[PDB]
Structure formats: structure tokens, C-alpha cells
């Protein structure tokens, strides 16, 4: 709680400045402080939280993939032994990544999810929970890999169940959840057919509801629908 002495509003203000400066580690720390004030987050604030950590972990995942590739190549036949350094440094990055994931999951568990009653907030947080378990699953190789995968699945499934009951098929949160759960199926759960079915059905049901929307809502929904299409194109 290094941010314990800073006003909630000041933390939010600084998170926005940090975003403008592309200082995503700072942005995440500010938003962690804001969450730890204990008040619920507004929509704008939830998006600041998600953007900050997505950017931090996104960078860690990209670095982890570079290092894992180098490590895999070192373990091929005819590769000269270079010692423990590649594994050590991949492990260092991995540990830092896991730490960030644990931090986010911690904020969600203490106490964002339990206080979130509106569908838009609850689905958003449960999607985040699925996402950060998914990132843990990407690097998991041990006894708990199955349980980590199941934790992601469970969180996404709860979010899906609420979204289908409470939100229109074009709702950007419902769409983004479906996009990410579809990727979970393809990349984590070894279920490409489920991934493809989910993406297709989500796209088609959104298409059918676009007629209800304003120009601005149409823009928001079609943006994510295009991501669904992009993934379908990659996979088929």
C-alpha cells in the first residue's frame, strides 16, 4: 500500500496521465491503489484498470515467448550447451508475469467481484479473472496446470452465463468475453471446434441485433465483431 496516502481521485487522475505517457507499470500501480481504497469502480475506472494490466502483462507475455523460443531451440539436437542462463532468465520473466497475474486476481478476489452486482461490472471482472488464469495457464507446466485451466474456464463460463441472460448480443463486454473465451478454447483447452463455434455463433447473433443500435453503438460492436471474424479467418 505505497499508494495508501494518495487520494482516490488523484490516483485516477495519475493513471490517466500515465496512460497518456505510455507508463503502463505506473498506470497499473495507480489503479491498484485506487481499487484498494475499497469503493466500487465506475465503467471508466474499470477500463483504466484493465488497460493498465493488459499492457503490463502483454509485454511480459511477449518477452516470455521470445525467451521460451530461444530455450526450446537450445534443447534441439545439435545445439551447443550454453549453460543455465536461458532457463534462468525465462524463469525470472515467468515469475514476474505470474506475480502480476496474482496481483490482478487478488484485486478481483478482494473484493471487486463480490461487490459487483450489475451485469456489466460482474461480467467484466469475471472475464478479467478468466483472462489472468489464462495467462497463468500459458506458462504452467506442473501439477496444477489442469486446475489453473479449470479456473480460467469456470470464470469465463460464469461470465458467459450472466452475459447471455442480462446483455444484448451486441454488448461490447459480451462480445469481448466471447472473443477471449473462444481464444481460451483454441489455445489453452485444445478445443478448436468449440472456439470456432463460439466465435461464429457470437458473430452471427450480434449481426442480427445491429439494427437496434445507434451509429456510435454500431461502431463499438462492429469493432469487436471484426476481431471475431479475424480469428475465424486465422482458424479456418
Amino acid at each position: 500500500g505505497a499508494m495508501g496516502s494518495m487520494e482516490r481521485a488523484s490516483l485516477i487522475q495519475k493513471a490517466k496521465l500515465a496512460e497518456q505517457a505510455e507508463r503502463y507499470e505506473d498506470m497499473a500501480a495507480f489503479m491498484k491503489g485506487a481499487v484498494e481504497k475499497g469503493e466500487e469502480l465506475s465503467c471508466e475506472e474499470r477500463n483504466l484498470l484493465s488497460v493498465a494490466y493488459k499492457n503490463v502483462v502483454g509485454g511480459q507475455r511477449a518477452a516470455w515467448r521470445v525467451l521460451s523460443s530461444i530455450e526450446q531451440k537450445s534443447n534441439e539436437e545439435g545445439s551447443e550447451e550454453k549453460g543455465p542462463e536461458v532457463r534462468e532468465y525465462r524463469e525470472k520473466v515467468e515469475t514476474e508475469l505470474q506475480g502480476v497475474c496474482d496481483t490482478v486476481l487478488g484485486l478481483l478476489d478482494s473484493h471487486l467481484i463480490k461487490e459487483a452486482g450489475d451485469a456489466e461490472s460482474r461480467v467484466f471482472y469475471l472475464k478479467m479473472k478468466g483472462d489472468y488464469y489464462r495467462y497463468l495457464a500459458e506458462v504452467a507446466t506442473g501439477d496444477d496446470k489442469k486446475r489453473i485451466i479449470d479456473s480460467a474456464r469456470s470464470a469465463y463460463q460464469e461470465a458467459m452465463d450472466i452475459s447471455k441472460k442480462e446483455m444484448p448480443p451486441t454488448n461490447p463486454i459480451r462480445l469481448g468475453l466471447a472473443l477471449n473465451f473462444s481464444v481460451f478454447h483454441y489455445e489453452i483447452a485444445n478445443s478448436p471446434e468449440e472456439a470456432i463455434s463460439l466465435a461464429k455463433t457470437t458473430f452471427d447473433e450480434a449481426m442480427a441485433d445491429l439494427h437496434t443500435l445507434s451509429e456510435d453503438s454500431y461502431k463499438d460492436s462492429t469493432l469487436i465483431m471484426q476481431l471475431l471474424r479475424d480469428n475465424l479467418t486465422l482458424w479456418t
Partner: peptide
């Protein structure tokens, strides 16, 4: 790598 949001 596939798109996520």
C-alpha cells in the same frame, strides 16, 4: 497469435 481484448 489471435485477437483478444
Amino acid at each position: 497469435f489471435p485477437a483478444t481484448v
